[PDB]
């Protein structure tokens, strides 16, 4: 019981971070 939309955004945001770094 997490939020699919928020989680996918969370993951999307984390991938940008990893890619920038």
């Amino acid at each position: 019981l997490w939020n699919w939309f928020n989680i996918t955004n969370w993951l999307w945001y984390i991938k940008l971070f990893i890619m920038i770094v």
Epitope: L1, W2, N3, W4, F5, T8, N9, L11, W12, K15
Partner: antibody
Framework: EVQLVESGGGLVKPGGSLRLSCSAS????????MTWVRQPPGKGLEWVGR??????????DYAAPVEGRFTISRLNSINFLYLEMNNLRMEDSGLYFC??????????????????????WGRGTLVTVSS | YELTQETGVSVALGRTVTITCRGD??????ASWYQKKPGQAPILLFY???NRPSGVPDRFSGSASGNRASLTISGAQAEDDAEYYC????????????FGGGTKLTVLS
């Protein structure tokens, strides 16, 4: 052992309402996302709408042709999905399916909110909107 | 109408054929693919990057690049004659889903 059975199709006058029902068994329904899909005879499939799970707060989305006229709902103790259509049109005529809907997101290549897909289907129930 | 598919495609028995699905959202999102025969329920064939569900023969595989998703059938059988629908997001970031117009796959007789 997954069984999806839609019900409630019939002749309706083109200003009227109709409630459709989708019975579910053979999977964890309470947490499953469910989508409604329609097909006019001799024509394509059209996405109607989708109800999410707990943790999405059962948020519901609708294709633009049905916003405000159609309402998706559910009751989880008996595993029944529902579709209330009001102010029907001849465009709304078709074979309506309920589909068990998985969610997909590939961390590395994906983009929010990923995509949804229809893993199980019922045989549908026939809706004829003609005056 | 954001997903475009060939209206018809034919294939000789035993040969290989590929159907396309096309939209701007396909630059961001994968498509799922569905077989549909008259009087029968759609069958999920393939979805996301590499996912074939249990029960679907290996001759079916999807791919993607650019604004295109392709379902390829390798070793076409009589029973593959059907309509095929792609599905994805109508637009990038959308919570809605849309179907393509459908492709009539004819296994030539």
């Amino acid at each position: 052992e997954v069984q999806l059975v839609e019900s409630g199709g019939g002749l309706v006058k083109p200003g009227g309402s109709l409630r459709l029902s989708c019975s579910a068994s053979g999977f964890d329904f309470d947490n499953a996302w469910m989508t409604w899909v329609r097909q006019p005879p001799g024509k394509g499939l059209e996405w109607v709408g989708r109800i999410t799970g707990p943790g999405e707060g059962w948020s519901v989305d609708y294709a633009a042709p049905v916003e405000g006229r159609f309402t998706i709902s559910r009751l989880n103790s008996i595993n029944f999905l529902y579709l209330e259509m009001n102010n029907l049109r001849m465009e709304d005529s078709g074979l309506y399916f309920c589909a068990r809907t998985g969610k997909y997101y590939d961390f590395w290549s994906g983009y929010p909110p990923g995509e949804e897909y229809f893993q199980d289907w019922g045989r549908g129930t026939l809706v004829t909107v003609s005056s | 109408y954001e997903l475009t598919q060939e209206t018809g495609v034919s294939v000789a028995l035993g040969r290989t054929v590929t159907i396309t699905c096309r939209g701007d959202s396909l630059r961001s999102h994968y498509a799922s693919w569905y077989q549909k025969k008259p009087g029968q329920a759609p069958i999920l064939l393939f979805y996301g990057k590499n996912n074939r569900p249990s029960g679907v023969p290996d001759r079916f595989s999807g791919s993607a690049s650019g604004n295109r998703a392709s379902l390829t059938i390798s070793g076409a059988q009589a029973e593959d004659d059907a309509e095929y629908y792609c599905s994805s997001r109508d637009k990038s970031g959308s919570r809605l889903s849309v179907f393509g117009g459908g492709t009539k796959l004819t296994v030539l007789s």
